Every structure is written in structure tokens, then in C-alpha cells.
Amino acid sequence: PMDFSINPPQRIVFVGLGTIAQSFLPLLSKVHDLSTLEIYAIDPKTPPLIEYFANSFGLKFINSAIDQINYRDILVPILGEGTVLINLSTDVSSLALIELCRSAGALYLDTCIEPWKGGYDDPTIPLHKRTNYHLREQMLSLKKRLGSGVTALVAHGANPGLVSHFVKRALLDLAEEILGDCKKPSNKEQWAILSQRLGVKVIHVAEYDSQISQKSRERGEFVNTWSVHGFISESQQPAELGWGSHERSLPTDASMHTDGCGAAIYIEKPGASVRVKTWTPFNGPSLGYLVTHHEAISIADFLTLRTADETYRPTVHYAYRPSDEAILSVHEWFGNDCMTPEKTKVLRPGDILSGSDYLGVLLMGHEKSSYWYGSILSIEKAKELATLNTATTLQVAAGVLSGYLWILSHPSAGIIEAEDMDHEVALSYISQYLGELKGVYSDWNPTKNNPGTFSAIDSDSPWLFSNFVL
Ligand SMILES: NC(=O)c1ccc[n+]([C@@H]2O[C@H](COP(=O)([O-])OP(=O)(O)OC[C@H]3O[C@@H](n4cnc5c(N)ncnc54)[C@H](O)[C@@H]3O)[C@@H](O)[C@H]2O)c1
């Protein structure tokens, strides 16, 4: 059930005008006439293309930094009914803006629950209160307090965001193939009942970035297909993962949250040091980094089934195989005591020679072993679909556009996550920007090629976390 056309708002406000924000303006141009809209962008960093932006939409740019002092003064004159606040910044508290948008009655959209300046790596803050799990529980507590009201969709980019919709569709594919049941769940509980009935035990966000760089890294240069400092920051945080009801042995140097709706583990080691085996359509078995991610918790909680005596819950976490440049950069990064790099470079469309960003979810434990579903977007395809976009950026920008259109057509939903949306509508908005949406089955498991652990008669034994992590 989808709206043929969604009317534009009266005003848009971009808190932060970085890569993703710029990668998103072209996509937004096709949908809505940016000249009939008053569009603000608040960023302390003036971009080079700010002139072309002003000579196409009349972009009212504000060179300022949003902090606890001046945020309630730069925005209040700008926020109101009919305004959409799109937060694509760093160091700005999403939760702080949510409450502010509720007062002004404005719609809110972001791709990450960011705290204020320095909320991730703050030694003065206790560790267990610096995890994505804790950031999410703050959002959920604010969701309960505010309750019904103007919509605010958080953490809806590519991942977290689209991948949540991929999980739902993957479950329906498995349901049609294994169970012959074409019945769509109607609520969270029914989604969890389906995951349990199929026997889903492990879900990976298995991403493989095969994009090749035009030129080679210069000395001391950290290169990546998206934000370098955003990648280093996520790589530095402790690895987190949803812990499933099938697991037995616990990871080493690990702690756990159990006061919520499901077990959530955070390992006291950087995600860039925790390597896990996974599977992607690029070349099958792959090695990724167990990077902490929002969807690792939201997906697991979404498919958690708690009854009087039993509990069902899959293991869910990110498995990221980044570009060849980032891997080599991470290597040198460790060699320099993880100090901030001398030089940085986010690869642009002109810098990428070939390759694709395989972004999808890998569901495991069911009758057919492994099933991968997601977006396979090549760089060449992205260049023909929009400007200022790589394969990595376009998948995110598409996620932003999807959430943008949902909050306009559903502006009275309060605070919501990707799981609260209608995945069918969410993907139909932007399916054309995701290149190839395919589902691939595979008889793979982390023990198939390791004689020391291979088993074909113990059902869930091959799906234990000990078999995935190195
Ligand atoms: N869900 C996803 O798939 C996904 C993918 C990538 C990024 N993101 C998120 O989107 C957000 C933006 O990421 P990006 O890749 O474009 O990073 P970026 O660094 O290219 O852009 C972030 C921008 O925010 C600006 N900024 C920093 N402090 C600010 C302040 N106090 N006030 C206003 N602006 C400020 C910076 O100048 C920068 O231009 C991040 O929070 C990131 O976590 C989500």
C-alpha cells in the first residue's frame, strides 16, 4: 500500500551538509522541485559546490556549529509545522533535536543516533553507557515519554536502515520457499514467530566493497569509499552483537546487557580487530570486521520472542569487508598506534575505477543453510543513476530518500525505526537506485571448510559464534 505521489513539505533543514547530504540532493531533485522549497543547510564547514547548490535551489546556507548552547537558537526560528529536519551531521545529539522538533511540530529524519560532541570515545563515561545498545535505549525511553505525535524516523540510511527491510523480505522469501506460506506477518510478534519457525539462528549484515581505486594510496593516506573519520570512529568502538538463544560458548573479554528485551554483548576490543567469517555474492566465503552497528540490536530485538518459559532470539551483527584501500589503511593505522591519520581521502566517483558495493543480509540456520539478500550496486551503475554518488553513497542516499518519503506520508507515527515501517513501501520508493536486488541461496556454513569443526548432524552446532570469529 503505497502513495502514488507524495507532496513536498514547506521547508527543509539540513543539519550538516557533508557527503551523504550532497549525495542526497540529486535524488531529492527528481522527486520534488527544489526551487519551490525553502531549503536550509547548517554546517560549520563550507563545501566547494555551495555555489552550484545556491544556483539551483536557492540554498540558504548557514556556516555555524550546532552545540548545546546555540542549537535552540539557530533552529527555533527555522522549525515549525510543515518543516522536515534532515540530520546528516556528526557531533549533534539526535535526541536533542527530536525533542526540539516535537515542540516546533516538525518532522525529523537521521541515519544515526549520534550523541553530542564526544559521546562515543569519552573515558569519563562508563563503558556500558557508550555502546550503541545504550544509545538505542535512550531513544526508546524518549519514544515512550513523548509517545504519539509528529513523526521522527531515526537510523534510516543504508545500514542501519534499508538492511532492516532486507531482513523482512528475506524472511518472506524463505517462508515461500521452505514453508510454502505466502502469509505476511502483521506485527512484530508475527515476524518473530516466522523467524523462529524457519529456524533462523544467525543474521549477518554481510557487506563487501569491491570498488577499486583509480590510483594507489600515497604515503600516510587513509582512503575509504565513505567518511574516513566516520569509519575510524566506528572501527574504534568495541564490537557489539545481538546474542541469540542458540549460542552456548561466550566470547572472550566480553560483557553483556540483559536488563532489556534480549541479550546484547559488547566485546572490549575494537571492531577493526574482531574478524568474522561470512558470505557474500562477490566470491562466497569472505572475512569482515565485527563493527558495532545500530541494526545489530534493533534486528535482534525485532525478532526476539519471549514467552512465559521460553525465549527465541537470533545472533545478529555487522560483518563488514570494506574496500581494498580501507583494509590497507586499517593495517597502517594499527601500525601507527591507531593515531589519527596524517592524510585522509574519501573516494569520489572520478576516483573509483570499477567494482560494486554488495550490501545485504545473510540469514542462516534455516533448512537451506544460508540465504543472502540485498543490493548489488556497481560504480558504473551509480554514475548513470545520479551525480555526486558512488556505489556506497547512493545506497545510503536511497535510504535517506526512503525515510524522507515515509515520514511525509506517515507524519503522525512519533519516534520510529526502520522496523516500524512497511518494508514493501520503504523499498518500492527507491528500488531503482539499488542496482540489482537479488537473493542467493548457499550451502555454506563457517565449518564446511574447517575439518576441525565441520558437523552435519548437530543442527545448530555449525551456527555457534565460536565457528564464525577468528
Ligand atoms: N545508515 C547509514 O547507512 C549511514 C552511512 C553513512 C553515514 N551515516 C550517518 O550520517 C551522518 C553524516 O555522515 P557523512 O558520511 O556525510 O559524514 P561527513 O563527515 O561527510 O558529513 C558530516 C557533516 O556534519 C558536519 N558537522 C560536524 N559537526 C557539526 C555541528 N556541530 N553542526 C553542524 N554540522 C556539523 C560536518 O562538517 C560534516 O560536513 C553521520 O552521523 C553518520 O553516522 C549513516
Author numbering: 0 to 469
Paper text:
Bacterial HSS is mostly found in α-proteobacteria and in some β- and γ-proteobacteria, including pathogenic strains such as Legionella pneumophila, Brucella spp. and various P. aeruginosa strains, including PA7 and PA14. It catalyzes the conversion of two molecules of putrescine (PUT; 1,4-diaminobutane) into one molecule of sym-homospermidine [HSP; bis(4-aminobutyl)amine] as the main reaction along with several side reactions. Bacterial HSS is NAD+-dependent, active at neutral to basic pH with an optimum at pH ∼8.8, and shows increased activity in the presence of 50 mM potassium ion. BvHSS forms a dimer, with each subunit containing a boot-shaped substrate-binding pocket between an NAD(P)-binding Rossmann-like domain and an HSS-like domain. The cofactor NAD+ is bound as a prosthetic group in the binding pocket with its nicotinamide ring being part of the active site.
The reaction mechanism of the nicotinamide adenine dinucleotide (NAD+)-dependent bacterial HSS has previously been characterized based on crystal structures of Blastochloris viridis HSS (BvHSS). This study presents the crystal structure of P. aeruginosa HSS (PaHSS) in complex with its substrate putrescine. Six PaHSS molecules were modeled into the asymmetric unit and refined to a maximum resolution of 2.42 Å. All six PaHSS molecules contain an NAD+ molecule in their binding pockets, and molecules A, C and E additionally contain a PUT molecule in the active site. We assume it to originate from the expression host and to be co-purified within the active site of PaHSS. The ‘inner’ and ‘outer’ amino groups of the PUT molecules form salt bridges with the carboxyl O atoms of Glu206 and Glu233, respectively, with distances of between 2.8 and 3.2 Å. Although PaHSS was shown to be a monomer in solution by SEC-MALS (the theoretical molecular weight of the monomer and the estimated molecular weight according to HPLC-MALS were 52 kDa; data not shown), these interface areas indicate the formation of three crystalline dimers by the six protein molecules within the asymmetric unit. The NAD+ molecules similarly insert their nicotinamide rings into the active site of the binding pockets, albeit with a slight offset. In addition, the ‘track-and-trace’ loop and particularly α-helix J of PaHSS are shifted in relation to BvHSS, providing more space for the pocket entrance compared with the BvHSS structure. However, the geometry in PaHSS is less favorable and the interaction energies are thus assumed to be weaker than in BvHSS.
